[PDB]
Design an enzyme around this catalytic site. Structure first.
Site, PDB file in Angstrom:
ATOM      1  N   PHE A  48      34.203  36.007  44.147  1.00 54.66           N
ATOM      2  CA  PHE A  48      33.591  35.925  43.075  1.00 54.66           C
ATOM      3  C   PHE A  48      32.727  37.020  42.820  1.00 54.66           C
ATOM      4  O   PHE A  48      31.697  36.678  42.096  1.00 54.66           O
ATOM      5  CB  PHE A  48      32.975  34.593  42.556  1.00 54.66           C
ATOM      6  CG  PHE A  48      33.940  33.538  42.489  1.00 54.66           C
ATOM      7  CD1 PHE A  48      34.607  33.080  41.157  1.00 54.66           C
ATOM      8  CD2 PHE A  48      34.066  32.553  43.548  1.00 54.66           C
ATOM      9  CE1 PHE A  48      35.656  32.022  41.259  1.00 54.66           C
ATOM     10  CE2 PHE A  48      34.939  31.493  43.358  1.00 54.66           C
ATOM     11  CZ  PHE A  48      35.697  31.265  42.046  1.00 54.66           C
ATOM     12  N   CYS A  49      33.110  38.227  43.101  1.00 59.58           N
ATOM     13  CA  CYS A  49      32.672  39.647  43.116  1.00 59.58           C
ATOM     14  C   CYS A  49      33.747  40.499  42.156  1.00 59.58           C
ATOM     15  O   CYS A  49      34.696  40.232  42.153  1.00 59.58           O
ATOM     16  CB  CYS A  49      32.542  40.012  44.701  1.00 59.58           C
ATOM     17  SG  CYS A  49      31.664  41.551  44.617  1.00 59.58           S
ATOM     18  N   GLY A  50      33.039  41.476  41.473  1.00 61.95           N
ATOM     19  CA  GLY A  50      33.702  42.572  41.016  1.00 61.95           C
ATOM     20  C   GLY A  50      34.710  43.065  41.951  1.00 61.95           C
ATOM     21  O   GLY A  50      35.713  43.296  41.741  1.00 61.95           O
ATOM     22  N   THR A  52      36.227  41.722  44.519  1.00 59.84           N
ATOM     23  CA  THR A  52      37.317  41.037  44.849  1.00 59.84           C
ATOM     24  C   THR A  52      38.471  41.239  44.245  1.00 59.84           C
ATOM     25  O   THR A  52      39.419  41.563  44.847  1.00 59.84           O
ATOM     26  CB  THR A  52      36.987  39.724  44.413  1.00 59.84           C
ATOM     27  OG1 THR A  52      36.004  38.932  44.814  1.00 59.84           O
ATOM     28  CG2 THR A  52      38.281  38.415  44.425  1.00 59.84           C
TER      29      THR A  52
END
Length: 195
Positions: A48-50, A52
């Protein structure tokens, strides 16, 4: 000024070959001599990271560098913004159906979720992190950093990366925001330099 990459320290403190990790799908312990003599890209990952969204680019890297003796290894870690909340049994499912979603599957091995910083960090990461300078002067904002204690050589964020040479010794370390295509081209430059 933010550098895209740092070269790892000029001496040795051992190799990655005394360490291992459990596979995310099976809990099978894998000592890293299963990759003896390969170039290894260690990447701590999150869902749930940019960044990702760079999972598919990692696949491309792996696919295009596989004929040149490169293996990518992924280590899920919830320590950066809590961006890996899922259990081990949930992480591949989320990659496939949620983010990136669309049926995405890594074409490289993921290991069990664990720490890369703090007093419970996995030992391979103690070795990697202290074999190379840190990626950035900027340590970051500690409200987003869920470990203790904090040290200069800590991994800064999700998707930091280490290249380890065919003798098991770290070679270089990339800032997490460096484009994956530049990681790929840096690796090929290294490969072509060292014949």
């Amino acid at each position: 000024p933010q550098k895209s990459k740092v070269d790892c320290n000029k001496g040795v403190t051992g190799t990655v070959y005394e360490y291992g990790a459990n596979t995310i799908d099976g809990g099978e312990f894998v000592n890293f001599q299963q990759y003896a003599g390969k170039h290894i890209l260690f990447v701590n990952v999150a869902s749930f990271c940019g960044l990702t969204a760079t999972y598919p680019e990692l696949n491309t890297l792996q696919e295009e560098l596989k004929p040149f003796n490169v293996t990518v290894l992924g280590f899920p870690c919830n320590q950066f913004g809590k961006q890996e909340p899922g259990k081990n049994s949930e992480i591949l499912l989320g990659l496939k159906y949620v983010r990136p979603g669309g049926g995405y599957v890594p074409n490289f091995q993921l290991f069990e979720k664990g720490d890369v910083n703090g007093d419970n960090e996995q030992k391979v990461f103690s070795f990697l992190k202290n074999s190379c300078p840190p990626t950035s002067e900027l340590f970051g904002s500690p409200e987003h950093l869920f470990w203790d204690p904090m040290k200069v050589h800590d991994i800064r964020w999700n998707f930091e990366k280490f290249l380890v040479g065919p003798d098991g010794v770290p070679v270089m370390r990339w800032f997490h925001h460096t484009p994956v295509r530049i990681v790929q081209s840096d690796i090929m430059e290294y490969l072509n330099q060292t014949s």
